[PDB]
Structures are given as structure tokens and as C-alpha cells.
Amino acid sequence: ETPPDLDFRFTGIKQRLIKSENVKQVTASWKRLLVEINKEFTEIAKIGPSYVPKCDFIDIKDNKLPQQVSELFKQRGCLMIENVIDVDRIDIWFNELVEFCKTHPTFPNPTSWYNVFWSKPQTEARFHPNMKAIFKAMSKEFYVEDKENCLIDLDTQLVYGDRIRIREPGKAALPLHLDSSSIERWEDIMYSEVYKSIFEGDWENWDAFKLDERTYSKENLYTICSSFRTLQGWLALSNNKSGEGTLRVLPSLKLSMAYIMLRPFFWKDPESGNIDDYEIDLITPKFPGTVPGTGQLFLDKFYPHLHQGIISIPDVKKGSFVFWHCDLPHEVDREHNGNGHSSVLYYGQTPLSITNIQTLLDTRDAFLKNISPADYRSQLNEEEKQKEFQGANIDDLKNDIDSKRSMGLEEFEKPENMSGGQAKIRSIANQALKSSGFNVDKYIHHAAKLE
Numbered sequence: 001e002t003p004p005d006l007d008f009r010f011t012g013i014k015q016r017l018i019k020s021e022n023v024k025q026v027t028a029s030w031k032r033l034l035v036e037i038n039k040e041f042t043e044i045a046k047i048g049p050s051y052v053p054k055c056d057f058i059d060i061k062d063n064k065l066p067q068q069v070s071e072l073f074k075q076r077g078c079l080m081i082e083n084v085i086d087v088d089r090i091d092i093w094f095n096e097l098v099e100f101c102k103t104h105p106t107f108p109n110p111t112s113w114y115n116v117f118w119s120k121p122q123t124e125a126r127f128h129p130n131m132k133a134i135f136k137a138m139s140k141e142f143y144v145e146d147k148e149n150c151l152i153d154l155d156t157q158l159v160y161g162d163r164i165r166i167r168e169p170g171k172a173a174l175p176l177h178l179d180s181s182s183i184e185r186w187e188d189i190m191y192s193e194v195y196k197s198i199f200e201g202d203w204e205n206w207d208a209f210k211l212d213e214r215t216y217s218k219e220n221l222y223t224i225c226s227s228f229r230t231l232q233g234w235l236a237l238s239n240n241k242s243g244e245g246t247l248r249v250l251p252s253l254k255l256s257m258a259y260i261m262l263r264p265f266f267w268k269d270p271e272s273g274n275i276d277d278y279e280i281d282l283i284t285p286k287f288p289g290t291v292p293g294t295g296q297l298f299l300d301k302f303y304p305h306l307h308q309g310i311i312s313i314p315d316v317k318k319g320s321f322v323f324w325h326c327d328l329p330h331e332v333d334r335e336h337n338g339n340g341h342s343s344v345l346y347y348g349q350t351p352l353s354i355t356n357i358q359t360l361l362d363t364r365d366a367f368l369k370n371i372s373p374a375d376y377r378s379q380l381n382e383e384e385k386q387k388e389f390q391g392a393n394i395d396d397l398k399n400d401i402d403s404k405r406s407m408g409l410e411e412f413e414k415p416e417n418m419s420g421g422q423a424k425i426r427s428i429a430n431q432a433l434k435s436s437g438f439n440v441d442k443y444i445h446h447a448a449k450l451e
């Protein structure tokens with residue numbers, strides 16, 4: 001009923017985040033927020049899955065989302081793109097994955113997750129021209145203002161190795177949450193600056209797509225994903241109707257994060273039910289749904305105003321791609337009472353950026369050694385480590401130079417004309433590929449001082 005206390009240091013986190021002079025404004029903003037939430041989340045609940053933005057791969061011209069799709073995607077924080085990959089190609093990839101899993105050990109496994117990272121179908125999927133295209137189009141929804149200095153190149157996609165899911169009917173399920181850290185959004189300096197507009201009482205002007213500060217955020221100050229992903233995503237390897245062992249989302253990005261970020265300050269709902277009776281809590285170290293040191297923020301217990309907004313995604317067809325913003329609440333369906341396997345291949349957007357240089361190095365090292373990337377490799381014992389085989393084949397990259405750069409296998413080109421942070425991050429990556437090591441702290445410390 002009451003969220004637990006964390007250590008009392010978290011009280012000083014609260015007093016760092018909201019300035020005394022802004023307390024009145026923040027309180028007013030929380031009341032405005034709840035009124036908007038009840039209106040908009042009601043509409044979502046009454047519309048259902050068609051609320052999620054959806055478009056056809058052919059609608060993407062010149063590697064840009066059309067204007068109407070863009071506008072809906074920035075509001076709703078998720079998108080389903082249909083017909084990215086032909087069904088026949090999808091079938092071949094699915095069958096090759098299953099073969100690989102059956103020849104490289106129980107099948108089906110208990111959890112519906114298969115720790116295969118570098119198989120040929122994965123490498124081919126990741127680098128299919130239609131897949132590169134949709135990532136290019138997504139990358140144009142994000143931006144930075146300080147182009148001269150911010151160490152990010154949104155024109156470059158890196159590979160973060162991830163696994164596959166093949167969920168049989170009857171396999172039950174991990175509640176509503178955010179990934180990309182449990183407590184960091186509040187605790188880290190640069191991460192919390194992402195949400196400054198909310199902490200100042202102006203949630204309405206929070207821009208989820210501006211990356212100047214997030215570029216330097218530490219998602220792990222201490223279940224953990226080691227890369228900075230702007231978007232989570234996956235490619236559909238099966239046809240499954242809404243609710244059949246798929247994904248559920250809360251398709252309202254700004255309202256979601258205004259509520260989440262302020263919830264530690266307004267965690268006590270009043271007995272009156274009158275929104276005008278909330279009052280700020282700047283004292284208790286309560287950060288509901290958090291477990292410092294873990295990767296997920298849980299929303300299933302102390303975030304009740306969110307629940308009305310949760311919907312299944314639209315019917316999924318083979319060869320559709322589904323994206324959601326790193327800040328979008330989501331969960332998987334509890335049950336799968338559909339007619340066949342619900343299977344996806346996970347692939348997120350991971351820009352070339354200062355907090356992703358370690359990822360670039362891990363990907364290069366794991367693929368070259370045919371082992372798990374670090375986030376999974378670190379959970380294996382000595383025997384498992386010596387046994388695993390990941391299907392990595394340089395030739396699956398089809399000697400495409402751009403693909404090899406995504407995998408950390410080739411230095412980045414820096415054209416005569418290119419400058420600013422884009423040129424600089426490419427150079428820093430190249431230096432790391434030459435030396436084989438990197439230390440992020442210097443860059444982070446400099447960004448935070450510059451504050």
C-alpha cells in the first residue's frame with residue numbers, strides 16, 4: 001500500500017531535482033497532468049490497439065517517416081511498420097533459427113527466450129536494406145541542438161547483440177515497466193537533466209527526442225542492458241493477433257514520463273479523490289517501483305493512473321517491425337491463447353555515441369570470438385562459456401562495409417565535409433578500435449561540469 005523507503009540519501013536526490021522556488025509550479029503542473037491523463041488515457045482505452053501508430057514500409061520515402069506518421073510517433077512513442085520484409089524470407093529465417101537452436105543446445109525451452117546472438121538469420125535481418133532504411137528513418141525523429149560538441153552520430157546504427165523469442169501458446173508471463181534503468185533517471189546527473197522541464201513545472205514542453213543531455217547519461221551507476229538504446233524494437237517472425245502473446249504499451253510518451261518522474265514527489269493519493277488535494281513530498285526517500293542497481297523500473301504497483309492507458313499492439317504480421325521509445329511503459333501479454341508461436345527477433349536502435357563505444361567493442365569482440373555479448377556472457381559459468389557457439393560468420397555480412405562498421409569490424413569514414421560531434425565521435429570510435437579499450441568517465445565528467 002505504501003512504497004518502501006530506500007536509503008535516506010534519496011531525500012537529498014529529491015531536493016537536488018526540484019528547486020524550492022519551483023515547488024508551487026510543480027504542484028500546479030501535477031494537477032494539470034492528472035486532468036490530461038484522465039482525458040487522454042480514457043480515449044486510449046476506448047479506442048484500443050488501432051491507437052498505435054502504424055504505417056507501410058512503402059509510405060517511407062527518402063528514408064523519412066511521412067509527416068502525419070512522425071507527428072503521431074512523437075506523441076505516442078511507438079510505431080508498427082508493415083511489410084518491411086517479405087513473408088517468404090521471414091519463413092526461411094525463422095526455420096534457420098529453429099534449426100540452429102535444435103543443433104546448439106530443452107526445445108521448446110521453459111522461458112520462450114533463446115540466447116542466440118550472431119546467427120546468420122540475425123546478421124542478415126539486421127542488415128537487410130529494408131531494415132537499414134527503417135532505422136535511418138527513425139534516427140531522423142531524434143536530434144541534438146549542440147551539434148558542434150555533442151558526442152553522437154545519429155546517422156550511424158550500431159549493433160547491440162540481442163536474442164530471439166519464440167513463445168508457444170500457453171506460455172504465460174513480467175509486469176508493466178520501463179527499461180533503461182530503475183533509479184538512474186532520477187539519480188544520475190546527466191540522466192536527470194533529460195527531464196528538467198518536468199522538474200521545473202513545465203512537463204508540457206518536455207521533448208523526448210532531444211538527445212543533448214541523454215548522450216551523457218549513465219544508465220547504470222552501480223537485468224542490466226549495457227547499451228544506450230533510443231528505441232527498443234523487433235522484427236515479427238510470426239502472425240499473432242492483439243493479445244496473443246505479443247506486446248502491450250502505453251502509447252502516450254510525454255504524459256507517461258511526466259507522471260513517472262513526478263510520482264516520487266506525489267506518491268500519496270488523497271482520500272478525497274480531489275486532484276486539488278495532492279501536496280508535494282520532498283522528504284521521504286520513496287522512489288516507488290525502483291530497485292537501485294537493476295535495469296527496470298516497475299510500474300505495476302504504485303503507478304495506478306497509468307493502467308487505464310495500456311493496450312495491446314495491433315495484429316502483428318510476419319515482416320513487420322515494431323519500435324517503441326526507451327521511455328515507453330510496456331509489458332508482454334500474460335497469456336498466449338493464439339493459434340501458433342509468437343516469435344520475434346529483437347533489434348534496437350543504438351546510435352554511435354559516447355556511452356556506446358563500449359558496446360561497439362563488445363560487439364566486435366563477441367562476434368569475432370563467436371560468444372555471447374557481455375550482458376549475457378557474464379551470466380554463464382566456466383563450462384557454459386567454453387561450450388557456447390553463436391553462429392558468427394564474417395561472410396554473413398556479405399562484405400558490406402557499412403554493415404561491418406555497425407559491428408565494430410571496420411573504421412568509420414569521416415568525409416572532408418563532416419564536422420562537429422558527429423566527426424568527433426567517429427574519431428573516438430576509431431581510436432578505441434585501434435587501441436582496443438576506452439574509458440567513458442572523462443567525457444561524462446566534462447559534460448556534467450559544463451552544466
Ligand SMILES: [Fe+3]
Nearest residue numbers: 177178179330
Ligand atoms: Fe522491457
